[PDB]
Each structure stands twice: as C-alpha cells, then as structure tokens.
Design a protein around this ligand. Structure first.
Ligand SMILES: C[C@H](N)C(=O)N[C@H](CCC(=O)O)C(N)=O
Ligand SMILES: [Cl-]
Ligand SMILES: [Cl-]
Length: 231
C-alpha cells in the first residue's frame, strides 16, 4: 500500500544518510517504486519520455510531465488539494533551475508535513512543515498514487548513524528499543526487500526475533549508503 511506502520513507528521517545518489528525485524514485514495483515506464522504472527531458537530465520541475505516471495508475494535476501520499513538484528558484520534488506525508489543517531530500542542501531525507496556502503557490504538479530475499549470515553490525530502531517485524510498523552510534551486535539472518530495506535479524533475550533496518533497497539492490559496517 501507500501507507507501507510512506512508513518506509518516514523511517529514513534522521538517518542523516542519502537515499540515492542523494538528490531530491532519488527519494521520489524510491517511493514510487515501492508503490509500483512492477512498472516498466516511469520515474521508478527509470524510463521516461525523451520529449523533455533535455540534455538527458531529469529536472524536478518537469517530473509530472516527463514520466508516464498515468500508465501505472497515478493521476497528475496542476490543481490540489494536497493529500497524504502525493508526490509534488515545485518550480525553479533562485539558483535552482530544475526546481524541487517532495512527498506529502500528512495534511493537518493548513499544515503540510513534507518528506524531502536535498533541501538545503542536506543530501539526506528530512521532515519539514509548510503552510498549504503558501506552498501551493510554487506547486507545478500534484501526483496522486493509486517481495523479499533471505539468507543466513553470522555477522556483526557496527552502527554508524545516530540510532536505529529495533523491531519485532521487518517492516516499519512496534519499537522494542534502539541501537546507538558505535554500538555492535551479532545477527544470523539477512532480509533484502526488493523495494524497502535491508534488515539484519537475530534472536533476542526474550527468545524472539528482533529486526533491524540497515539501509534502503531499490529493485533488490542497496539504494543509498548502509547505516553501519559489517564484519
Ligand atoms: C532511532 C531513531 N530515532 C530513528 O528513528 N532511526 C531510524 C531507524 C528507524 C527504523 O528503521 O525503523 C533511522 N536511522 O532513520
Ligand atoms: Cl518521447
Ligand atoms: Cl511510456
């Protein structure tokens, strides 16, 4: 679903680690793919119209028009309203000819909750808040949306981000505890989501499997740096 995909983006917040590539569209791309993993055309699919598209570059301001969103069930519009789950493009600004692209996480009153990457710069996912009434003045398009591979490995992960949540399931929805930067722990299992996260897993004290996310995947490969080192 769209919620499962949104949850996966929410959980990127605070990694301080780039999804991608590291640019704004890499986050959009990854999110789209989570919703349309099997699309053949589109942003996540890596295939769009060369029609424009100029110089073989992406250009965030044109993403709504440069990819065949409709082919995969997405609607595209220059009119709102905002709603959770949309991908939203924004016009060019001072020193940014290509503009910007973001993800709407939530709509509460006039508050937009926006997930985005390379706003700053700050080449990693950030949550920010904006006013709808003010934000809509820069919106180009509103883009509205409609397994896993596993093995044993007995390794040790050393955390290289501020903290990672410990979960009872390898999806991003009940947090047992966290691991902080520098800490270490052993695992016996690896799970590679085709479109999601790499998880390592182990048996905790209580007798039950804990799960730990360790970085984003796209199309079954890592899609950004890892949240730690492995030995
Ligand atoms: C622990 C910290 N508050 C946090 O939110 N970390 C997330 C991981 C949460 C998760 O993957 O479920 C991260 N490194 O982005
Ligand atoms: Cl074309
Ligand atoms: Cl097409």
């Amino acid at each position: 679903t769209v919620n499962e995909a949104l949850n996966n983006v929410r959980a990127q917040v605070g990694s301080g680690v780039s999804v991608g590539n590291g640019e704004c569209y890499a986050l959009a791309s990854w999110y789209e793919r989570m919703i349309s993993p099997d699309a053949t055309v589109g942003l996540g699919a890596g295939v769009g119209w060369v029609s424009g598209a100029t110089g073989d570059t992406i250009s965030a301001k044109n993403i709504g028009s440069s990819y065949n969103w409709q082919a995969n069930g997405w609607t595209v519009s220059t009119s709102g309203p905002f709603q959770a789950g949309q991908i939203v493009t924004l016009g060019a600004t001072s020193g940014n000819p290509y503009g910007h692209v973001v993800i709407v996480e939530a709509v509460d009153g006039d508050r937009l909750t926006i997930l985005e990457q390379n706003y700053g710069g700050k080449r990693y996912p950030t949550r920010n808040y904006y006013s709808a009434a003010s934000y809509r003045q820069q919106v180009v398009h509103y883009i509205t949306p409609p397994g896993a591979r596993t093995y044993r490995e007995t390794g040790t992960m050393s955390v290289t981000v501020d903290a990672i949540n410990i979960r009872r399931a390898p999806n991003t929805s009940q947090i047992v505890a966290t691991y902080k930067r520098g800490e270490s722990f052993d695992y016996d299992t690896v799970i590679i989501d085709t479109n999601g996260y790499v998880w390592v897993s182990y048996i905790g004290s209580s007798g039950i499997r804990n799960y730990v996310a360790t970085g984003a995947t796209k199309d079954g490969k890592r899609y950004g740096d890892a949240w730690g080192t492995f030995k």
